[PDB]
């Protein structure tokens, strides 16, 4: 899968936003891909890094982070105040067919839209 | 919200299977809320756990999928291999609702992109 521009649609709290993010090469040291949004400033852009390892079991890792900028008085250049992180990892094995991996991926993707998760994340209230 | 029966649709490689799972109590030691599927055998069980923390708020979600194979020269089945998953969110104290919702929706939508399905289903580097 060669890197290319990715356009996600129908996102946000109200479901009307969207973002376009384009590749930014691969790091030869650890073989991690990268993507970012063209935000006109290198330090205030959302970025995504995805990498899959090799064996004695495979491991896929996805990281998402995006900063928030605030222009405090007494200065001109914006800085970063807080950041929101994310992390996803998979631990499939050698003798696993693609059916099980696809099932796990679809289960995780559809579990992030159920009322339980959208209530436990947006409002940060523990489930009981 | 309190735990309740959760049904998932359009699950699977071809988008035709269906997974229904029901609550399985709350652990009082560390406050993880479990879920499980009525598979008639406790060992061959697909389980999901979700828990949030209190102070840098932390949200964790774990998915576990065991595979059952009929052991040779035995009656009861045994687990051979297992597939894991994990999600971790690390919002801060002053983070508003919109930022968290944006992160969650971005993670949900990005996981259906051709890049991720190629990287997971076929396990080939990008």
């Amino acid at each position, epitope marked *: 899968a060669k890197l290319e521009t*990715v*356009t*996600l*649609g*129908k996102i946000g709290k109200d*479901g*009307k*936003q*969207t973002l376009v993010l384009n590749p930014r090469g691969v790091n030869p040291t650890n073989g991690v891909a990268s993507l970012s949004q063209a*935000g*006109a400033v290198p330090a205030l852009e959302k970025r995504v890094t995805v990498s899959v390892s090799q064996p004695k079991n495979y491991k896929v890792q996805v990281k998402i982070q995006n900063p928030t900028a605030c222009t405090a008085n007494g200065s001109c250049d914006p800085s970063v105040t807080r950041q929101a992180y994310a992390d996803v990892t998979f631990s499939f094995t050698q003798y696993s067919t693609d059916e099980e991996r696809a099932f796990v991926r679809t289960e995780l993707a559809a579990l992030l839209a159920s009322p339980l998760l959208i209530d436990a994340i947006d409002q940060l209230n523990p489930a009981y | 919200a309190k735990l309740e029966t959760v049904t998932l649709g359009k699950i699977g490689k071809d988008g035709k299977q269906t997974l229904v799972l029901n609550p399985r109590g709350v652990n009082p030691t560390n406050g993880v809320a479990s879920l499980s599927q009525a598979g008639a055998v406790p060992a061959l069980e697909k389980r999901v756990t979700v828990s949030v923390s209190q102070p840098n708020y932390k949200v964790q979600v774990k998915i576990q999928n065991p595979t059952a194979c009929t052991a040779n020269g035995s009656c009861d089945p045994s687990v051979t291999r297992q597939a894991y998953a994990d999600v971790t969110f690390s919002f801060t104290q002053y983070s508003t609702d919109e930022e968290r919702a944006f992160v969650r929706t971005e993670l949900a*939508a990005l996981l*259906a*992109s*051709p*890049l991720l399905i190629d990287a997971i289903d076929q396990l080939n580097p990008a």
Partner: antibody
Amino acid sequence: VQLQQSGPELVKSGTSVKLSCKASGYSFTDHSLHWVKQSHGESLEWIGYFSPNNGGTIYNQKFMGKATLTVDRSSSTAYMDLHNLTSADSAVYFCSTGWDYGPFDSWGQGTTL
Amino acid sequence: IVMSQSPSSLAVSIGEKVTLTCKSSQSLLFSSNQKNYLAWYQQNPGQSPKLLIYWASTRESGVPDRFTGSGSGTDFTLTISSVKAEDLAIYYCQQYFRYPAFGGGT
């Protein structure tokens, strides 16, 4: 958010006119302010938009000659200019806003010419 | 991008399950995930129009359930569960990626 335009206008021959859109209740950080027009009766046409995250100087084809979009950030007022008036000064012009690539959320009433 | 539509006028009066069809000159599967970029507007003859459906299948908040939209790769349609007292006036369709472009009438 709600926005309203500023008054019908009546111009003669070919001169310059001032059309302004008063927007109150939202920030220009990510939204794009469009300038769709309807002409008269049937059909409607696009003109352009101003978005700080995409350049803010995008115009519809064959309209660069008779359009100019400027925005004052302090007063949160966006006003656009016309240069020649032969058939452009025909009927109502609209003012719209929305997300970066999403649909047009809310419109205000349009001034007639 | 020309956005052709149904003929200019219809003559449905009441109770009829009238449907409106539209055609596009280029596939609208712009997003990486399979999401369409159409939206349906209705405009009363007096004032500015309103938004009804976006993403070609999602109803906007504050709209009666009688409206329903379905979409495909390049052939979209809009079906209303019978026409009520106030469901008249012109209906428009729009695509909102790159260069937006309206087109058509009732």
